Design a binder for this molecule. Sequence first.
Ligand SMILES: C[S@@+](CC[C@H](N)C(=O)[O-])C[C@H]1O[C@@H](n2cnc3c(N)ncnc32)[C@H](O)[C@@H]1O
Ligand SMILES: C[S@@+](CC[C@H](N)C(=O)[O-])C[C@H]1O[C@@H](n2cnc3c(N)ncnc32)[C@H](O)[C@@H]1O
Lengths: 163, 163
Amino acid sequence: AAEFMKITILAVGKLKEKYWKQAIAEYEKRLGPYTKIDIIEVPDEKAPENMSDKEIEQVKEKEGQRILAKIKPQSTVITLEIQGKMLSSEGLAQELNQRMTQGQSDFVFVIGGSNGLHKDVLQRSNYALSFSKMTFPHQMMRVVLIEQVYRAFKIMRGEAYHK
Amino acid sequence: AAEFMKITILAVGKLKEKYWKQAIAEYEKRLGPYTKIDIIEVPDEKAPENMSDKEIEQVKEKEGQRILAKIKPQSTVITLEIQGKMLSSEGLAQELNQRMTQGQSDFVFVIGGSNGLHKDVLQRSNYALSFSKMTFPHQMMRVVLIEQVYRAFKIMRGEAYHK
Ligand SMILES: C[S@@+](CC[C@H](N)C(=O)[O-])C[C@H]1O[C@@H](n2cnc3c(N)ncnc32)[C@H](O)[C@@H]1O
Ligand SMILES: C[S@@+](CC[C@H](N)C(=O)[O-])C[C@H]1O[C@@H](n2cnc3c(N)ncnc32)[C@H](O)[C@@H]1O
């Protein structure tokens, strides 16, 4: 218990709108006293409309190589996958708290680019996490995720906010 | 087919952050050419932390009376409920398109305040829609919803955006 948790949001591409940036800064600020959190962005390939199957795969492969070069073998990797496992807000806090009680302290949340994640990234994942059956765009998704991490930490500390 | 669809987002409370306001204005602008959309806000009760069961109920009842006074008997009411039915993005477009083909053109999406929705509002609902098992705060939820309505209309028109 001599260590605070470490949360990394590892995402593909930069945010393009000032309002998403402002939302993320506010949740980073709110999460500051509870965990070290940092956001790491890696280059996104250009994503035209209707590319071939081949081209989609190559985009995911290039982005995947960048994502994997930023991940250490000992980190607990949680990949955001539409078709991953669904958890309630109390369920996400339970899963992180359980892993923390088990000694895990370095969590890396991974967000794919517009075409999703390469099989090698999905294979390295220690937990596939779905936020919904719906498809969220990657910029907004980053905000939704950090707000939910904020929520999970309030629940874990048993502090008011989740109504 | 002499009419465009009408989308109303009926929510409790005003937005407090300029960045959520900016996000909503951008999606309203993008949706403009495809549907009439408008956002109607009704007063939110104060929501302290840990109120009694009784007090929570009374908050939902007051907000519910305001919400129901803005709803017409012929509108198709879709209530956002964490425990409602889950749909994928293609599923939400299918449900709206199906209803439109059946003659429905006035859709009212309802977002509760921090404590959720009163039973009378939930009873008037023609469809309980869940966006996730997780709990989203009401301000962010409004953004997530309008982005998804934007997405459903692009899918329904068979126009690129959903990758
Ligand atoms: C536009 S989405 C991916 C669409 C792609 N067709 C797929 O099937 O993954 C971009 C990234 O955002 C994240 N994301 C979007 N919606 C999500 C959801 N409902 N649950 C978990 N992650 C989601 C995922 O990490 C995804 O790689
Ligand atoms: C903080 S939430 C409600 C929490 C309350 N304990 C409940 O059980 O409804 C405020 C409003 O946002 C909307 N909302 C939040 N998360 C949602 C989700 N995952 N799916 C559908 N609606 C949601 C709902 O309309 C809800 O009334």
